[PDB]
Amino acid sequence: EARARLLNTQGKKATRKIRERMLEESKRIAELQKRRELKQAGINVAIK
RNA sequence: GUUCGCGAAGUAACCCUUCGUGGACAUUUGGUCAAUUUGAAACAAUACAGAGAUGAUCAGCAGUUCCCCUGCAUAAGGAUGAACCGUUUUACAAAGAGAUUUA
Ligand SMILES: [Mg+2]
Ligand SMILES: [Mg+2]
Ligand SMILES: [Mg+2]
């Protein structure tokens, strides 16, 4: 319990940020391979 | 349209009427702006969650910003208002030791 406790220094807010940011990156990757597979159909859809 | 005056005609007896003409009086509004889709309100609803300092549950003041919102406000609130929490290499040298090349 303690040996696990010491190792995280931040507090709820920072961790919350780590998540939010990664979720943004999943959004990016997804939207990309959206556009990639649409290029494999040749139809070119512009990014927002 | 008024008035002054002239001329003409008629009525007349110096006038009443009609015609013509001269003169004066009176003298430049408004527009940054066309009448609903295509020159710009903002909320709400759906889904996703669902409140900083900590191991945890709360009071809070601040600080910076090419973010502001409510408020008459130089008051005070808006999660202590929100954003901050991340990515990170060179004024660069001196001494010593081994390998390589050359005068
Ligand atoms: Mg305040
Ligand atoms: Mg609080
Ligand atoms: Mg504040």
UniProtKB/Swiss-Prot annotation:
Protein's cellular compartments: Cytoplasm; Nucleus
Q: Which domain of life is it from?
A: Eukaryota
Assembly and oligomerization? Belongs to the NTC complex (or PRP19-associated complex), composed of at least CEF1, CLF1, ISY1, NTC20, SNT309, SYF1, SYF2, and PRP19.
Which family is annotated? Belongs to the CEF1 family.
Give the miscellaneous note.
Answer: Present with 784 molecules/cell in log phase SD medium.
Primary role? Involved in pre-mRNA splicing and cell cycle control. Required for the binding of the NTC complex (or PRP19-associated complex) components to the spliceosome to mediate conformational rearrangement or to stabilize the structure of the spliceosome after U4 snRNA dissociation, which leads to spliceosome maturation. Its absence leads to an arrest of the cell cycle, possibly due to the inefficient splicing of TUB1.
What is the designated name of this protein?
Answer: Pre-mRNA-splicing factor CEF1
Q: Which residues of the full protein are shown?
A: 154 to 201 of 590
